[PDB]
From a paper:
Platelet–endothelial-cell adhesion molecule-1 (PECAM-1), also well known as CD31, is a 130 kilodalton protein which belongs to both type I transmembrane glycoprotein and immunoglobulin (Ig) superfamily. PECAM-1 can be divided into three parts: extracellular region which contains six immunoglobulin-like (IgL) domains with nine potential N-glycosylation sites, transmembrane region with one single α helix, and cytoplasmic region which possesses two separate tyrosine residues (Y663 and Y686) described as immunoreceptor tyrosine-based inhibitory motifs (ITIMs). As a cell adhesion molecule, PECAM-1 functions principally in cell junction but also plays a role in leukocyte trafficking and immune response. Among adjacent endothelial cells, PECAM-1 interacts with homogeneous molecules in a trans-homophilic binding manner that does not rely on transmembrane and cytoplasmic regions.
To avoid the uncontrolled glycosylation in insect cell expression system that might impair crystallization, we mutated three potential glyco-sites on IgL1-2 (N52Q, N84Q and N151Q). The whole structure of IgL1-2 was finally determined to 3.0 Å resolution where one asymmetric unit contains two IgL1-2 molecules (chains A and B) forming a dimer. The homodimer of PECAM-1 IgL1-2 displays a trans-binding pattern that relies on the interactions between IgL1 and IgL2 derived from two opposite molecules. The two IgL1-2 fragments are packed to each other in a face-to-face antiparallel pattern with the side face of one β sheet. There are two interacting surfaces, one between IgL1 of chain A (IgL1-A) and IgL2 of chain B (IgL2-B) and the other between IgL2 of chain A (IgL2-A) and IgL1 of chain B (IgL1-B). After analyzing the interaction surface of IgL1-2 dimer, the solvent accessible areas buried in interfaces on chain A and B are 1079.0 Å2 and 1094.2 Å2 respectively, and there are two types of reciprocities consisting of hydrophobic interaction and hydrogen bond. On interface1 (IgL2-A-IgL1-B), residues including K158, N187, F188 from IgL2-A and L74, L81, E117 from IgL1-B form the core of the hydrophobic interactions, while N115 from IgL1-B forms satellite hydrophobic interactions with I190, R149 from IgL2-A by donating C and O atoms on backbone to reinforce the hydrophobic contact. Similarly, interface2 (IgL1A-IgL2-B) residues including L74, I112, K116 from IgL1-A and R149, P155, F188, I190 from IgL2-B form the hydrophobic center while the C/O atoms from N115, Q84 on IgL2-A and N187 on IgL1-B form satellite hydrophobic interactions. Thus, the hydrophobic binding core surrounded by hydrogen bonds gives rise to the homophilic dimerization of IgL1-2. No interface was found in one asymmetric unit except the “bridge” contact. In contrast, our structure shows trans-homophilic dimerization of native IgL1-2 in one asymmetric unit, and the last peptide chain 214–228 in IgL2 does not swing out from its own architecture (Sup Fig. 3).
Residue numbers in the entry:
A (entry chain A): 31 to 65, 68 to 228
B (entry chain B): 31 to 65, 67 to 229
The structure:
Amino acid sequence: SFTINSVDMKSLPDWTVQNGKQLTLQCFADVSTTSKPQHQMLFYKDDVLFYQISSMKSTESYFIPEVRIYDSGTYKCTVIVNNKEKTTAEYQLLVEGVPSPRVTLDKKEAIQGGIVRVQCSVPEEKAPIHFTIEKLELNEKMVKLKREKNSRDQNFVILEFPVEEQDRVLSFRCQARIISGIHMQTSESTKSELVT
Amino acid sequence: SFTINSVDMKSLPDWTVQNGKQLTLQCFADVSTTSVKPQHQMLFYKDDVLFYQISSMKSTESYFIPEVRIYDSGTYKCTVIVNNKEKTTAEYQLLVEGVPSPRVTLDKKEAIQGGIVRVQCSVPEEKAPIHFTIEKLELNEKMVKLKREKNSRDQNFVILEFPVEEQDRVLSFRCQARIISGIHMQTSESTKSELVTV
């Protein structure tokens, strides 16, 4: 006969992981037998099934090449043998850090009084993302203007910016934030362009 | 100077699809411009949640689902960006039809009187929520000896224990699964045979 002794869920490299790395989720099962069993394993994230495998081996794995904060959450894995169950404790996977964001400008040469639509997207992540956008000024070395913006439905923003008669050479720099249980920030990003 | 004329979102073969088949979602954009081929950024959403992101130079981009499942069914919209101008498709309602035949599993191949038989019925290609029906059937009798209904909010399978009567010695169980969408879908049967001793 059989015995589901106990069940684990290891996380390689850890239950906390730097954004961008690869991550592996394991489901271990200790099984006692009197001469060899097939397992069925179900991986849940937040009690929603996302992977299913039936194998002869006691450790089963799930590979994430590129961890993202959207992957962060509550993980449990259930193992069935000969229609007997047992369920791992809950495991909280924590993803840290935000990739540098992508800034984009409709113009690279702009006129005075006019406008310049500036996009800032974190393409490798999903909403909700908070942005901070500084309008920087080169011939003066001073931040003219800052915009905070919260992006509920999207992972990007397009802001209109006015060309004040005040200068001719300027760039915009951006920085994004996302949550994992506490809060995560990026490095900056910029692109240059000029005014008449 | 660019102008996004319009954007659509076609579905191959259709916005209604049989469970199990391959499906292609396209995001098209009509672009008029006075210039220089433009760069596109397209965002595929499901239920107003993003699932695919791609930047291309051609106007049509695709997303392939090799085996559609009802869990993939939902509201699909796609918004495309060119030169930091937006436009978002209408919403599209994709509908998936049919449930795969379920998979029945028995802890015993031989059971003794009065004892139990744990019966699993799983639909592994689909996710919760699933309604199951498990009948204990009889070869020498062909009448339903016993039925168990069960709804599974959390799981894509059920394990019901069944009693072995003394009335019989060889019996099989048959199962059929249901999932609802506002419209509900049924499966075919599944069975596996096994017997009893004194």
